[PDB]
Design a protein around this ligand. Structure first.
Ligand SMILES: *[C@@H](CC(=O)Nc1cc2c(Nc3ccc(F)c(Cl)c3)ncnc2cc1O[C@H]1CCOC1)CN(C)C
Ligand SMILES: CN(C)C/C=C/C(=O)Nc1cc2c(Nc3ccc(F)c(Cl)c3)ncnc2cc1O[C@H]1CCOC1
Ligand SMILES: CN(C)C/C=C/C(=O)Nc1cc2c(Nc3ccc(F)c(Cl)c3)ncnc2cc1O[C@H]1CCOC1
Length: 307
Protein backbone atom coordinates (compact mmCIF):
# COMPACT_ATOMS: atom_id res chain seq x y z
CA UNK A 1 0.00 0.00 0.00
CA UNK A 2 2.11 2.85 -1.35
CA UNK A 3 1.42 6.48 -2.33
CA UNK A 4 -1.66 7.52 -4.29
CA UNK A 5 -1.01 6.74 -7.97
CA UNK A 6 -1.70 10.20 -9.28
CA UNK A 7 -1.26 9.39 -12.96
CA UNK A 8 -3.49 11.12 -15.50
CA UNK A 9 -5.58 8.91 -17.74
CA UNK A 10 -6.19 10.92 -20.89
CA UNK A 11 -9.29 10.20 -22.95
CA UNK A 12 -8.84 10.80 -26.67
CA UNK A 13 -11.45 11.52 -29.32
CA UNK A 14 -11.80 9.35 -32.45
CA UNK A 15 -11.60 12.58 -34.51
CA UNK A 16 -7.91 13.09 -33.59
CA UNK A 17 -6.51 9.99 -35.36
CA UNK A 18 -5.64 9.81 -39.07
CA UNK A 19 -4.08 7.44 -41.67
CA UNK A 20 -4.80 4.22 -39.72
CA UNK A 21 -3.22 1.06 -41.19
CA UNK A 22 -3.21 -2.48 -39.70
CA UNK A 23 -0.22 -4.43 -38.31
CA UNK A 24 -1.73 -7.84 -37.39
CA UNK A 25 -3.41 -10.11 -34.84
CA UNK A 26 -5.24 -6.30 -32.96
CA UNK A 27 -2.66 -3.49 -33.37
CA UNK A 28 -2.67 -0.55 -35.83
CA UNK A 29 -0.41 2.21 -37.22
CA UNK A 30 -1.76 5.73 -36.98
CA UNK A 31 -1.27 9.45 -36.46
CA UNK A 32 -2.50 11.48 -33.51
CA UNK A 33 -3.20 15.20 -33.99
CA UNK A 34 -4.20 16.83 -30.66
CA UNK A 35 -6.85 19.57 -30.77
CA UNK A 36 -5.58 21.93 -33.49
CA UNK A 37 -2.02 21.98 -32.11
CA UNK A 38 -0.73 21.31 -35.65
CA UNK A 39 1.56 18.37 -34.80
CA UNK A 40 1.75 14.72 -35.79
CA UNK A 41 2.46 12.13 -33.11
CA UNK A 42 2.83 8.68 -34.70
CA UNK A 43 1.00 6.04 -32.69
CA UNK A 44 0.20 2.39 -32.29
CA UNK A 45 -3.35 1.39 -31.40
CA UNK A 46 -4.21 -1.88 -29.62
CA UNK A 47 -7.83 -3.18 -29.51
CA UNK A 48 -11.73 -4.41 -18.92
CA UNK A 49 -8.74 -6.74 -18.42
CA UNK A 50 -7.32 -4.48 -21.15
CA UNK A 51 -8.24 -1.67 -18.70
CA UNK A 52 -5.70 -3.12 -16.25
CA UNK A 53 -3.00 -3.07 -18.96
CA UNK A 54 -4.01 0.56 -19.47
CA UNK A 55 -3.77 1.38 -15.74
CA UNK A 56 -0.20 0.00 -15.72
CA UNK A 57 1.06 1.67 -18.93
CA UNK A 58 -0.58 4.90 -17.77
CA UNK A 59 1.34 4.65 -14.50
CA UNK A 60 4.90 4.13 -15.85
CA UNK A 61 7.42 6.81 -16.95
CA UNK A 62 10.95 5.76 -17.94
CA UNK A 63 13.16 5.97 -21.04
CA UNK A 64 13.19 2.14 -21.45
CA UNK A 65 9.48 1.45 -20.87
CA UNK A 66 6.47 2.18 -23.10
CA UNK A 67 4.00 4.72 -21.76
CA UNK A 68 0.30 4.91 -22.65
CA UNK A 69 -0.51 8.24 -24.33
CA UNK A 70 -4.16 7.55 -23.77
CA UNK A 71 -7.24 5.42 -24.26
CA UNK A 72 -10.12 5.90 -26.66
CA UNK A 73 -13.71 4.87 -25.90
CA UNK A 74 -15.32 5.08 -29.35
CA UNK A 75 -17.08 1.79 -30.26
CA UNK A 76 -14.74 -0.23 -28.03
CA UNK A 77 -11.71 0.45 -25.83
CA UNK A 78 -8.38 1.31 -27.48
CA UNK A 79 -4.91 1.87 -26.05
CA UNK A 80 -2.81 4.58 -27.72
CA UNK A 81 0.99 4.64 -27.50
CA UNK A 82 3.97 6.13 -29.34
CA UNK A 83 4.66 4.17 -32.54
CA UNK A 84 7.95 2.27 -32.36
CA UNK A 85 8.83 2.17 -36.05
CA UNK A 86 11.20 -0.83 -36.06
CA UNK A 87 8.73 -3.11 -34.22
CA UNK A 88 9.68 -5.95 -31.87
CA UNK A 89 13.31 -6.75 -31.23
CA UNK A 90 12.78 -10.46 -31.86
CA UNK A 91 11.85 -9.76 -35.48
CA UNK A 92 14.57 -7.10 -35.68
CA UNK A 93 17.44 -9.42 -34.74
CA UNK A 94 16.12 -12.13 -37.06
CA UNK A 95 15.80 -9.54 -39.85
CA UNK A 96 19.42 -8.39 -39.28
CA UNK A 97 21.23 -11.58 -38.18
CA UNK A 98 24.26 -10.76 -40.34
CA UNK A 99 24.30 -6.98 -39.75
CA UNK A 100 24.14 -6.94 -35.93
CA UNK A 101 27.34 -6.41 -33.95
CA UNK A 102 28.60 -6.82 -30.41
CA UNK A 103 28.05 -3.25 -29.21
CA UNK A 104 24.38 -3.32 -30.14
CA UNK A 105 23.65 -6.63 -28.42
CA UNK A 106 25.29 -5.49 -25.19
CA UNK A 107 23.61 -2.06 -25.43
CA UNK A 108 20.16 -3.63 -25.64
CA UNK A 109 20.92 -5.92 -22.67
CA UNK A 110 21.67 -2.84 -20.55
CA UNK A 111 18.64 -0.96 -21.81
CA UNK A 112 16.31 -3.83 -20.99
CA UNK A 113 17.72 -4.36 -17.51
CA UNK A 114 17.44 -0.59 -17.05
CA UNK A 115 13.75 -0.77 -17.89
CA UNK A 116 13.16 -3.82 -15.69
CA UNK A 117 14.92 -2.28 -12.70
CA UNK A 118 12.54 0.63 -13.05
CA UNK A 119 9.57 -1.71 -13.01
CA UNK A 120 11.02 -3.36 -9.88
CA UNK A 121 11.11 0.05 -8.15
CA UNK A 122 7.46 0.65 -9.10
CA UNK A 123 6.64 -2.80 -7.62
CA UNK A 124 5.47 -4.15 -10.99
CA UNK A 125 6.14 -7.76 -11.87
CA UNK A 126 6.04 -7.91 -15.68
CA UNK A 127 5.35 -11.67 -15.92
CA UNK A 128 5.85 -11.73 -19.73
CA UNK A 129 9.35 -10.47 -20.48
CA UNK A 130 10.72 -11.77 -23.79
CA UNK A 131 12.36 -10.43 -26.95
CA UNK A 132 8.93 -10.13 -28.62
CA UNK A 133 7.77 -7.67 -25.91
CA UNK A 134 10.86 -5.51 -26.31
CA UNK A 135 10.34 -2.90 -29.06
CA UNK A 136 12.76 -0.78 -31.10
CA UNK A 137 12.33 3.03 -31.08
CA UNK A 138 15.59 3.39 -33.00
CA UNK A 139 18.18 0.64 -33.53
CA UNK A 140 20.05 2.02 -30.45
CA UNK A 141 16.99 2.65 -28.26
CA UNK A 142 14.74 -0.18 -27.06
CA UNK A 143 11.70 -0.17 -24.74
CA UNK A 144 9.78 -2.79 -22.76
CA UNK A 145 6.08 -3.15 -23.51
CA UNK A 146 3.09 -5.52 -23.19
CA UNK A 147 1.80 -5.37 -19.60
CA UNK A 148 -1.19 -7.66 -20.25
CA UNK A 149 0.00 -10.06 -17.54
CA UNK A 150 1.83 -7.44 -15.41
CA UNK A 151 0.97 -7.37 -11.68
CA UNK A 152 1.58 -4.85 -8.90
CA UNK A 153 2.84 -5.92 -5.47
CA UNK A 154 2.02 -4.45 -2.07
CA UNK A 155 4.70 -2.90 0.10
CA UNK A 156 4.23 -6.00 2.23
CA UNK A 157 3.73 -8.66 -0.47
CA UNK A 158 6.89 -10.29 -1.92
CA UNK A 159 5.25 -12.81 -4.33
CA UNK A 160 2.16 -13.08 -6.60
CA UNK A 161 -0.02 -16.20 -6.73
CA UNK A 162 -1.73 -16.97 -10.09
CA UNK A 163 -5.29 -18.30 -10.49
CA UNK A 164 -4.61 -20.27 -13.70
CA UNK A 165 -4.26 -18.67 -17.15
CA UNK A 166 -2.18 -19.00 -20.31
CA UNK A 167 1.47 -18.00 -19.78
CA UNK A 168 4.45 -18.72 -22.10
CA UNK A 169 6.27 -21.66 -20.49
CA UNK A 170 9.67 -21.27 -22.14
CA UNK A 171 10.41 -17.90 -20.45
CA UNK A 172 8.98 -18.88 -17.09
CA UNK A 173 10.99 -19.45 -13.97
CA UNK A 174 10.65 -22.82 -12.30
CA UNK A 175 8.67 -21.54 -9.28
CA UNK A 176 6.28 -19.95 -11.76
CA UNK A 177 5.87 -23.28 -13.63
CA UNK A 178 5.50 -25.52 -10.53
CA UNK A 179 4.00 -23.20 -7.89
CA UNK A 180 2.47 -20.29 -9.91
CA UNK A 181 4.65 -17.83 -7.98
CA UNK A 182 5.83 -14.58 -9.55
CA UNK A 183 8.51 -12.25 -8.21
CA UNK A 184 10.97 -9.73 -9.58
CA UNK A 185 13.40 -12.68 -9.46
CA UNK A 186 11.24 -14.71 -11.84
CA UNK A 187 11.36 -11.72 -14.25
CA UNK A 188 15.16 -12.01 -13.89
CA UNK A 189 14.90 -15.59 -15.20
CA UNK A 190 12.87 -14.32 -18.15
CA UNK A 191 15.50 -11.61 -18.76
CA UNK A 192 18.15 -14.34 -18.98
CA UNK A 193 16.09 -16.15 -21.64
CA UNK A 194 15.64 -12.84 -23.50
CA UNK A 195 19.42 -12.31 -23.53
CA UNK A 196 19.78 -15.88 -24.81
CA UNK A 197 17.23 -14.95 -27.53
CA UNK A 198 19.37 -11.96 -28.58
CA UNK A 199 22.72 -13.78 -28.40
CA UNK A 200 21.41 -16.47 -30.76
CA UNK A 201 19.93 -13.88 -33.14
CA UNK A 202 16.29 -14.71 -32.44
CA UNK A 203 16.33 -18.45 -31.93
CA UNK A 204 13.53 -20.34 -30.23
CA UNK A 205 14.10 -21.58 -26.68
CA UNK A 206 14.21 -25.36 -26.41
CA UNK A 207 13.31 -25.57 -30.12
CA UNK A 208 11.61 -28.94 -30.66
CA UNK A 209 10.80 -29.70 -27.01
CA UNK A 210 7.09 -29.19 -26.15
CA UNK A 211 5.89 -27.19 -23.14
CA UNK A 212 4.95 -30.31 -21.18
CA UNK A 213 8.52 -31.60 -20.98
CA UNK A 214 9.90 -28.21 -19.78
CA UNK A 215 9.16 -28.26 -16.03
CA UNK A 216 10.72 -31.76 -15.94
CA UNK A 217 13.73 -30.71 -18.05
CA UNK A 218 14.55 -27.85 -15.68
CA UNK A 219 14.02 -30.04 -12.61
CA UNK A 220 16.69 -32.43 -13.99
CA UNK A 221 19.22 -29.53 -14.13
CA UNK A 222 19.30 -28.79 -17.87
CA UNK A 223 19.27 -25.20 -19.20
CA UNK A 224 19.52 -23.39 -22.54
CA UNK A 225 22.95 -23.89 -24.11
CA UNK A 226 25.84 -21.43 -24.38
CA UNK A 227 25.34 -19.45 -27.61
CA UNK A 228 28.33 -19.77 -30.01
CA UNK A 229 29.10 -16.06 -29.83
CA UNK A 230 29.07 -15.94 -26.01
CA UNK A 231 32.19 -15.98 -23.89
CA UNK A 232 31.91 -17.95 -20.66
CA UNK A 233 31.68 -14.54 -18.91
CA UNK A 234 28.34 -13.76 -20.56
CA UNK A 235 26.98 -17.31 -20.29
CA UNK A 236 27.79 -17.37 -16.59
CA UNK A 237 25.42 -14.44 -16.14
CA UNK A 238 22.66 -16.17 -18.07
CA UNK A 239 23.06 -19.32 -15.99
CA UNK A 240 23.10 -17.22 -12.79
CA UNK A 241 19.68 -15.98 -13.91
CA UNK A 242 18.44 -19.55 -14.22
CA UNK A 243 19.42 -20.68 -10.75
CA UNK A 244 16.88 -22.67 -8.70
CA UNK A 245 17.13 -20.26 -5.74
CA UNK A 246 15.24 -17.08 -6.70
CA UNK A 247 17.28 -14.98 -4.24
CA UNK A 248 20.61 -16.22 -5.69
CA UNK A 249 19.89 -14.82 -9.16
CA UNK A 250 21.32 -11.44 -10.11
CA UNK A 251 19.36 -8.33 -9.37
CA UNK A 252 18.37 -6.03 -12.24
CA UNK A 253 20.60 -3.26 -10.82
CA UNK A 254 23.50 -5.71 -10.72
CA UNK A 255 22.73 -6.74 -14.27
CA UNK A 256 22.93 -3.16 -15.50
CA UNK A 257 26.43 -2.93 -14.06
CA UNK A 258 27.66 -6.30 -15.31
CA UNK A 259 26.43 -5.63 -18.83
CA UNK A 260 27.61 -2.01 -18.73
CA UNK A 261 31.20 -3.03 -17.90
CA UNK A 262 31.13 -5.48 -20.82
CA UNK A 263 29.78 -2.78 -23.15
CA UNK A 264 33.10 -0.88 -22.71
CA UNK A 265 34.86 -3.68 -24.60
CA UNK A 266 32.17 -5.72 -26.39
CA UNK A 267 34.63 -7.70 -28.50
CA UNK A 268 36.13 -9.10 -25.29
CA UNK A 269 32.80 -10.64 -24.21
CA UNK A 270 31.12 -11.45 -27.53
CA UNK A 271 32.98 -12.97 -30.45
CA UNK A 272 30.99 -12.21 -33.58
CA UNK A 273 32.44 -13.33 -36.90
CA UNK A 274 32.59 -10.18 -39.08
CA UNK A 275 32.17 -7.82 -36.10
CA UNK A 276 34.80 -5.42 -37.59
CA UNK A 277 32.46 -4.98 -40.53
CA UNK A 278 29.21 -4.41 -38.53
CA UNK A 279 27.52 -1.04 -38.11
CA UNK A 280 28.18 0.62 -34.75
CA UNK A 281 25.62 2.58 -32.73
CA UNK A 282 26.44 6.00 -31.25
CA UNK A 283 28.75 5.92 -28.20
CA UNK A 284 26.88 5.47 -24.92
CA UNK A 285 26.80 8.32 -22.43
CA UNK A 286 28.66 6.03 -20.03
CA UNK A 287 31.35 4.99 -22.55
CA UNK A 288 31.83 8.66 -23.44
CA UNK A 289 31.89 9.67 -19.75
CA UNK A 290 34.67 7.20 -18.90
CA UNK A 291 37.10 8.36 -21.61
CA UNK A 292 37.13 11.84 -20.05
CA UNK A 293 38.80 10.63 -16.80
CA UNK A 294 42.48 9.93 -15.97
CA UNK A 295 44.02 6.84 -17.62
CA UNK A 296 45.03 5.44 -14.18
CA UNK A 297 41.42 5.28 -12.95
CA UNK A 298 39.68 4.07 -16.17
CA UNK A 299 40.28 0.38 -15.34
CA UNK A 300 37.42 0.45 -12.77
CA UNK A 301 35.61 3.79 -13.33
CA UNK A 302 31.81 3.60 -13.24
CA UNK A 303 29.32 6.24 -14.42
CA UNK A 304 27.26 6.95 -11.27
CA UNK A 305 24.12 7.33 -13.40
CA UNK A 306 24.26 3.53 -13.83
CA UNK A 307 24.73 2.77 -10.12
C1 LIG B 1 6.66 -8.54 -33.15
C2 LIG B 1 5.91 -7.45 -34.00
C3 LIG B 1 5.63 -6.18 -33.24
O1 LIG B 1 5.85 -6.14 -32.04
N1 LIG B 1 5.11 -5.07 -33.92
C4 LIG B 1 4.83 -3.76 -33.41
C5 LIG B 1 4.33 -3.51 -32.13
C6 LIG B 1 4.15 -2.19 -31.68
C7 LIG B 1 3.63 -1.85 -30.42
N2 LIG B 1 3.10 -2.82 -29.52
C8 LIG B 1 2.06 -2.52 -28.57
C9 LIG B 1 1.92 -3.44 -27.53
C10 LIG B 1 1.02 -3.20 -26.50
C11 LIG B 1 0.26 -2.05 -26.50
F1 LIG B 1 -0.60 -1.83 -25.51
C12 LIG B 1 0.37 -1.12 -27.52
CL1 LIG B 1 -0.61 0.31 -27.47
C13 LIG B 1 1.27 -1.35 -28.56
N3 LIG B 1 3.50 -0.52 -30.06
C14 LIG B 1 3.86 0.48 -30.91
N4 LIG B 1 4.37 0.18 -32.15
C15 LIG B 1 4.51 -1.14 -32.52
C16 LIG B 1 5.03 -1.38 -33.76
C17 LIG B 1 5.20 -2.68 -34.21
O2 LIG B 1 5.71 -2.93 -35.45
C18 LIG B 1 6.36 -1.96 -36.29
C19 LIG B 1 6.97 -2.63 -37.49
C20 LIG B 1 6.10 -2.20 -38.65
O3 LIG B 1 5.60 -0.91 -38.33
C21 LIG B 1 5.41 -0.92 -36.92
C22 LIG B 1 6.35 -10.04 -33.37
N5 LIG B 1 6.06 -10.81 -32.12
C23 LIG B 1 4.70 -10.53 -31.58
C24 LIG B 1 6.25 -12.27 -32.32
C1 LIG C 1 21.22 -2.34 -35.79
N1 LIG C 1 21.99 -2.83 -36.95
C2 LIG C 1 21.84 -4.29 -37.03
C3 LIG C 1 21.50 -2.23 -38.20
C4 LIG C 1 21.41 -0.71 -38.16
C5 LIG C 1 20.41 -0.21 -38.90
C6 LIG C 1 20.10 1.23 -39.07
O1 LIG C 1 20.72 2.11 -38.50
N2 LIG C 1 19.06 1.41 -39.96
C7 LIG C 1 18.38 2.55 -40.46
C8 LIG C 1 18.70 3.87 -40.14
C9 LIG C 1 17.96 4.92 -40.69
C10 LIG C 1 18.22 6.27 -40.42
N3 LIG C 1 19.25 6.69 -39.55
C11 LIG C 1 19.47 8.04 -39.13
C12 LIG C 1 20.49 8.21 -38.21
C13 LIG C 1 20.81 9.46 -37.73
C14 LIG C 1 20.11 10.57 -38.16
F1 LIG C 1 20.42 11.76 -37.70
C15 LIG C 1 19.09 10.42 -39.08
CL1 LIG C 1 18.23 11.81 -39.61
C16 LIG C 1 18.77 9.17 -39.56
N4 LIG C 1 17.43 7.24 -41.00
C17 LIG C 1 16.40 6.94 -41.84
N5 LIG C 1 16.14 5.61 -42.11
C18 LIG C 1 16.91 4.62 -41.55
C19 LIG C 1 16.59 3.31 -41.86
C20 LIG C 1 17.33 2.26 -41.31
O2 LIG C 1 17.08 0.94 -41.57
C21 LIG C 1 15.96 0.38 -42.26
C22 LIG C 1 16.15 0.35 -43.75
C23 LIG C 1 16.63 -1.06 -44.06
O3 LIG C 1 16.65 -1.83 -42.87
C24 LIG C 1 15.82 -1.12 -41.95
C1 LIG D 1 31.48 2.00 -38.32
N1 LIG D 1 32.43 0.96 -38.83
C2 LIG D 1 32.97 0.17 -37.69
C3 LIG D 1 31.90 0.07 -39.90
C4 LIG D 1 30.59 0.46 -40.59
C5 LIG D 1 29.76 -0.52 -40.99
C6 LIG D 1 28.48 -0.24 -41.71
O1 LIG D 1 28.08 0.89 -41.88
N2 LIG D 1 27.80 -1.35 -42.21
C7 LIG D 1 26.60 -1.47 -42.96
C8 LIG D 1 25.85 -0.39 -43.44
C9 LIG D 1 24.69 -0.60 -44.20
C10 LIG D 1 23.88 0.43 -44.70
N3 LIG D 1 24.21 1.80 -44.53
C11 LIG D 1 23.60 2.90 -45.21
C12 LIG D 1 23.94 4.16 -44.74
C13 LIG D 1 23.37 5.30 -45.29
C14 LIG D 1 22.45 5.21 -46.31
F1 LIG D 1 21.91 6.32 -46.82
C15 LIG D 1 22.10 3.96 -46.79
CL1 LIG D 1 20.96 3.83 -48.08
C16 LIG D 1 22.66 2.81 -46.25
N4 LIG D 1 22.74 0.13 -45.43
C17 LIG D 1 22.38 -1.17 -45.70
N5 LIG D 1 23.17 -2.19 -45.21
C18 LIG D 1 24.30 -1.92 -44.48
C19 LIG D 1 25.05 -2.99 -44.02
C20 LIG D 1 26.21 -2.78 -43.27
O2 LIG D 1 26.99 -3.81 -42.79
C21 LIG D 1 26.73 -5.20 -42.99
C22 LIG D 1 26.89 -5.69 -44.41
C23 LIG D 1 28.34 -6.13 -44.46
O3 LIG D 1 28.68 -6.63 -43.18
C24 LIG D 1 27.75 -6.08 -42.24
Amino acid sequence: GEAPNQALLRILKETEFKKIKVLGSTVYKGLWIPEGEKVKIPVAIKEKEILDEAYVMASVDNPHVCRLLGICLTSTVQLITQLMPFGCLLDYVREHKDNIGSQYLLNWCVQIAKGMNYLEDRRLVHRDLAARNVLVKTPQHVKITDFGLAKLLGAEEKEYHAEGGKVPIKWMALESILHRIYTHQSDVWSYGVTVWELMTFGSKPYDGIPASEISSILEKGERLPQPPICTIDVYMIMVKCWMIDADSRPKFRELIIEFSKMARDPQRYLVIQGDERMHLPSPTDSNFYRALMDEEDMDDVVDADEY
